Structure 1
Amino acid sequence: EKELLEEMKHPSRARRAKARKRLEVVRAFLDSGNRPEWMILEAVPVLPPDLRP
């Protein structure tokens, strides 16, 4: 987050837009408290049988 905040001072507009796009997701993760590694599955849930009869 500090690195992208520093990047937000670039004169380039495209660089600023890309850094802002990265910061959106980074700040969403920081605010929600979710860990990024949870986007990788280790155990896959199995739906109850009555909904796949």
Structure 2
Amino acid sequence: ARRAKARKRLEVVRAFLDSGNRPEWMILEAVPVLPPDLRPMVQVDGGRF
């Protein structure tokens, strides 16, 4: 069961090793923002929004 969890953890490590992702990147300083057209503000017929 120690051998087992060391796998699960090690699978996450070697995940990061082989890709070149930095664990800290699962944290955000700069939150991205999605282009405005993909989340529009529009006037429907009655000039309402």
Q: Structure 2 length normalisation: TM-score?
A: 0.79
Structure ID, larger Rg = 2
Q: Runs ≥4 in structure 1, deviation > 3 angstroms? A: none
Q: Pick from 6, 9, 15: which aligns with 2:2?
A: 15
The two structures, once aligned, show a CA RMSD in angstroms of: 0.4
**Paired residues, number:** 40
Alpha-carbon distance in 2 for matches of 1:31, 1:40: 20
Instruction: Kindly indicate whether structure 1 or structure 2 has the higher relative contact order, using CA contacts under 8 Å at least 6 residues apart.
Output: 1
Alpha-carbon distance in 1 for matches of 2:8, 2:32: 31
Q: Percent identity?
A: 100
Name stretches of at least 5 consecutive residues in structure 2 with no aligned partner.
41-49
Residue 24 of structure 1: how far off its partner (Å): 0.2
Specify which structure has the higher proportion of helix.
1
Alpha-carbon distance in 2 for matches of 1:42, 1:16: 36
- Per-residue CA deviation, residues 2-52 of structure 1 (Å, 9 max, x unaligned), is xxxxxxxxxxxx110000000000001000000011110000000000000
Q: Equivalent residues in 2 for 1:34-53 (5 A)?
A: 34-53=21-40
